[PDB]
Design a protein around this ligand. Structure first.
Ligand SMILES: NC[C@H](CC(=O)O)c1ccc(Cl)cc1
Lengths: 417, 398
């Protein structure tokens, strides 16, 4: 009785960021909740056709071919990580499709003249940069180093960090990059005497970077690392056959490094459009999962997928027209684009708004690894300039280290005897 | 009928269409000669050309349409712009296709764990590192500095250079890297007494680097620059901080390094002709189309495709519906065995990478002149005397 409308999806179950493991049951939950309600789509039905993209553009290309050239006509695609998202979003203008990501954080995906029909619920990764500049200004650091991986997400984050950090009077003295092997840039960092290091790379690559860091002795009391807080909580103890450094050596190779992450979940206990608070959502998701939340990848991005499905459903209800969609005409797709561009509703992850800048969240969690575990050491709100410092960060010597130790004009005095 | 998927920019609207339009006469000559001599006895080579305007969207659309609507293609041939080439090359393994490019020179494609089915007849731009190593050994320059722009291609070229020198006794004294303005970094290079500088930067940044070198007085009789040579001809006066006389005074004597278009021997190639005769017939075939640099590499690529299809049919079952893993593996193992003297030298593959000749060129008074070659198969560097010169009497020493 209800005419089924189809959406395509690509969930990364492995690879750089295995977010599919916890963002796919969230999409299942959201689809069930929006199909049970008779107010949203009284005559249609949202159905899902998904593939495991493994977060690499090759299998993503194969599965995009299988999606766009098979039985059900799709009205929207939902890619996962930033690579697949960029590929699909720059390839989807030929088929006149809308692309709505849930876990894509590449600052380069904010270019409207290049990705014209692209939406996302994930915040842009430029939000970590003001937090990093604030932590540099607080601790009085003026010259930092970088070791990134040459993926467009990290390149864009580093560019934005550059124009941010140049605005407050801080300079990036040394820039290193690598595609699949970090040994050479790590030893160049060691040979160049870098102190404050900002690493922009995935976890399965952070393990290799830090094996090479341990073999170079680029750690201890003189070096401070600024990583990304979206890795697993035991990413350094995980057995990995590609690295030679054992677990006990790597546990001390990375010790006292700062990480930043966004909250992604509404801290208040008010009820959203789905009539469900954040606690009930998290509890239902945990009951729906197969393993514990701490070891299920992508648990912190499930509300983003929930809100993405709900926003898609609300924008389709605003137009309520669908089976007349084919990959040739531009009327239905730009109608849905105009419907989504003006979306505004209270989701499980806050006020969901599809703005161009991609920054609808404000609070940034700041952590530090102390004794093999992460401990929160502050919060930051970039707009109102609020730093809810908790005074918990530890250091070897009570005070944070300093790069480029300064000269000291010591006087010589006549011997008093 | 052995259908081949040909992807290359043929559209006039794109600037890179010049490459495809100048290459087409060479591939036409090669296929017509293969048909005349009838190398593939019962079959015939069918090259299907699908236009990709170097847009990732249009390139992926053309690839998909050729996969679905077109015939059962055995291989992919072409790929000129790096974006589309990377997109296709990473995904080839899903359709068990094998690509052979002739214009994609980026060093990232050399990774045979992300691009297992990709091959190249043109030397990548990180194959100039052993050439530079032999050039350094030729003048006893055992201490060099580097100035590297921080994008992917140059970062990978530098990360390969540092591994080429490992084992030798050439130590990289100072290592530098810049993103937007190199002035801050040329000062750090000067403040450490670096005499020989290996630069890996772009064409627009080269003018800035040479202006900052003139201001820092990093030139003259005791400094040597070794920068890439793939810059377009007359790239200095096209720029419009330092007036052109100082820019020319700062860049006089830099040694560019780049691959060589055609061979200079007279030994008969696999086609039965010599490189001079091939160049003559190519130049008299195309009437007004602009001459490209990859026409010899396209000739060699078509001959490689013909020979590998021949030696793959020799070991043979033959149908290919993009599901045949065995046929893909057979074509891979047959392509690994390519060894013949083409028009651009001997065609040998080392893990998908062509072992060719890298030429050296030196910016004399107002023009670049050839000053030597490096044959990577024999690992020999010969410097054409009477050409290379230095502002001082002897080569500048570190
Ligand atoms: N949602 C998290 C996001 C996913 C992505 O950018 O593909 C991410 C960004 C960076 C890292 Cl290191 C790990 C994960």
């Amino acid at each position: 009785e209800r005419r089924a409308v189809y959406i395509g999806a690509l969930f990364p179950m492995s690879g750089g960021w295995p977010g599919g493991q916890a963002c796919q049951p969230a999409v299942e939950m959201a689809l069930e909740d929006v199909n049970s309600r008779r107010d949203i789509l009284p005559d249609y039905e949202l159905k899902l056709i998904h593939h495991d993209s493994k977060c690499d553009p090759g299998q993503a290309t194969k599965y995009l071919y299988e999606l766009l050239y098979n039985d059900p006509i799709k009205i929207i695609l939902m890619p996962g990580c930033s690579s697949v998202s960029t590929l699909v979003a720059e390839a989807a203008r030929m088929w006149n499709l809308i692309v709505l990501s849930y876990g894509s954080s590449s600052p380069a995906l904010s270019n409207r003249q290049r990705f014209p029909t692209f939406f996302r619920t994930h915040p842009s990764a430029t939000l970590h940069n003001p937090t990093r500049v604030k932590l540099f200004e607080k601790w009085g650091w003026k010259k930092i180093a970088t070791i990134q991986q040459t993926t467009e997400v990290f390149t864009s984050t580093l560019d934005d960090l550059e124009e941010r950090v140049k605005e407050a009077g801080i300079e990036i003295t040394f820039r290193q990059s690598f595609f699949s092997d970090p040994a050479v840039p790590v030893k160049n960092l060691k040979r160049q005497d870098a102190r404050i290091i900002v690493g922009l790379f995935y976890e399965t690559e952070a393990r290799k970077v830090f094996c090479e860091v341990y073999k170079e002795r680029l750690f201890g009391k003189k070096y401070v690392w600024f990583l990304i807080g979206w890795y697993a909580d035991n990413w350094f103890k995980i057995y990995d056959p590609s690295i030679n450094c054992t677990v006990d050596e790597m546990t001390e190779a990375v010790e006292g490094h700062i990480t930043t992450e966004i909250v992604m979940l509404n801290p208040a206990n008010t009820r959203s459009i789905s009539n469900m608070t954040s606690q009930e959502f998290v509890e239902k998701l945990t009951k729906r999962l197969k393993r514990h939340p701490e070891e299920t990848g992508g648990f912190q991005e499930a509300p983003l997928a929930y809100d993405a499905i709900w926003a898609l459903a609300l924008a389709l209800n605003k137009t309520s027209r669908l089976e007349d969609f084919n990959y040739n005409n531009q009327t239905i797709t730009d109608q849905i684009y105009r419907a989504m561009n003006s979306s505004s509703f209270e989701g499980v992850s806050g006020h969901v708004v599809f703005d161009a800048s991609g920054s609808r969240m404000a609070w940034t969690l700041i952590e530090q690894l102390q004794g093999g575990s992460y401990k929160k050491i502050g919060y930051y709100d970039s707009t109102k300039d609020d730093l809810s410092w908790s005074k918990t960060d530890k250091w070897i010597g009570g005070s944070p280290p300093a790069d480029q130790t300064l000269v000291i004009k010591t006087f010589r005095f006549l011997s008093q005897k | 009928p052995l259908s081949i998927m040909g992807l290359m920019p043929l559209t006039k609207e794109v600037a890179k269409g010049s490459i495809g339009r100048g290459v087409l006469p060479a591939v036409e000559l090669a296929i017509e000669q293969i048909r005349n001599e009838s190398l593939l006895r019962p079959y015939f080579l069918d090259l299907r050309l699908y236009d990709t305007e170097c847009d990732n969207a249009k390139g992926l659309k053309a690839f998909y349409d050729a996969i679905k609507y077109g015939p059962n293609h055995l291989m992919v041939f072409g790929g000129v712009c790096p974006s589309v080439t990377s997109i296709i090359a990473e995904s080839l393994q899903g359709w068990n296709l094998v690509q052979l490019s002739f214009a994609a020179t980026t060093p990232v494609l050399a990774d045979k764990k992300k691009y297992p089915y990709f091959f190249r007849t043109v030397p990548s731009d990180n194959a100039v590192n052993p050439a530079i190593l032999k050039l350094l050994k030729h003048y006893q320059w055992k201490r060099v500095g580097t100035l590297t722009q921080d994008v992917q291609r140059f970062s990978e070229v530098r990360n390969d250079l540092t591994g080429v020198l490992y084992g030798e006794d050439i130590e990289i004294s100072d290592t530098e890297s810049f993103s937007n303005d190199p002035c801050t970094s040329v000062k750090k290079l000067k403040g450490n007494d670096v005499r020989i500088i290996l630069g890996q930067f772009d064409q627009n940044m080269a003018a800035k680097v040479f202006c900052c070198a003139y201001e820092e007085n990093m030139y003259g009789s005791k400094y040597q620059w070794i920068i890439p040579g793939w810059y377009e001809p007359s790239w200095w006066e096209q720029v419009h901080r330092c007036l052109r006389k100082n820019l020319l005074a700062a860049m006089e004597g830099y040694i560019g390094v780049d691959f060589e278009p055609l061979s200079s021997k007279q030994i008969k190639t696999i086609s039965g002709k010599t490189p001079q005769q091939y160049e003559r017939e190519y130049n008299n075939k195309r009437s007004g189309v602009g001459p490209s640099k990859f026409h010899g590499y396209a000739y060699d690529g078509i001959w490689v495709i013909a020979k590998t299809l021949q030696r793959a049919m020799e070991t043979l079952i033959q149908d290919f519906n993009y599901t045949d893993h065995t046929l893909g593996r057979i074509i891979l193992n047959a392509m690994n065995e390519t060894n013949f003297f083409g028009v651009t030298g001997q065609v040998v593959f080392r893990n998908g990478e062509r072992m060719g000749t890298i030429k050296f060129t030196q910016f004399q008074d107002s023009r670049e002149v050839k000053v030597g070659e490096y044959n990577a198969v024999a690992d020999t560097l010969e410097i054409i005397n009477d050409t290379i010169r230095f502002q001082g009497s002897e080569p500048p020493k570190d």
